[PDB]
Amino acid sequence: SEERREIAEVNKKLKQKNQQLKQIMDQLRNLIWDINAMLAMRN
Amino acid sequence: EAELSAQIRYLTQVATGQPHEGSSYSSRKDCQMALKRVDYARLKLSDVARTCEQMLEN
Description:
This is part of a larger assembly, with chains A (about 45 residues) and B (about 60 residues). Chain A is mainly α and about 45 residues long. Helices cover about 90% and strands about 0% of the residues of chain A. Chain A has one helix spanning about 1-40. Chain A starts with a helix and ends with a helix. With about 60 residues, chain B is mostly helical. Helix content of chain B is about 70%, strand content about 0%. Chain B has two helices and no strands. Chain B is rod-shaped and about 85 Å long. The chains are: A mainly alpha (about 45), B mainly alpha (about 60). Chains A and B meet through helix 1 of A and helix 2 of B. The PDB classes it as transcription. The entry lists the keywords Transcription, Mediator.
């Protein structure tokens, strides 16, 4: 009966963690895009 | 007097009366560009560092 109650927190916590990873990932990819664009035409 | 007279002769063989329009500006622009590119990199890295830092801590 209480299993459901306890499961929910792990789902929400995990979901929150995933959301945080999304912010880091989109930020790192923007950094790599910027360095690619700037370095491509240094010649 | 010997040294000064010799120096005047040397100048009499090296003087042309023109402004000498060589210079070294381009390579200096290129190097400055590269330094600010590295600075950009350092800024973005610090920002990623802090967001990872705040996620690891709950």
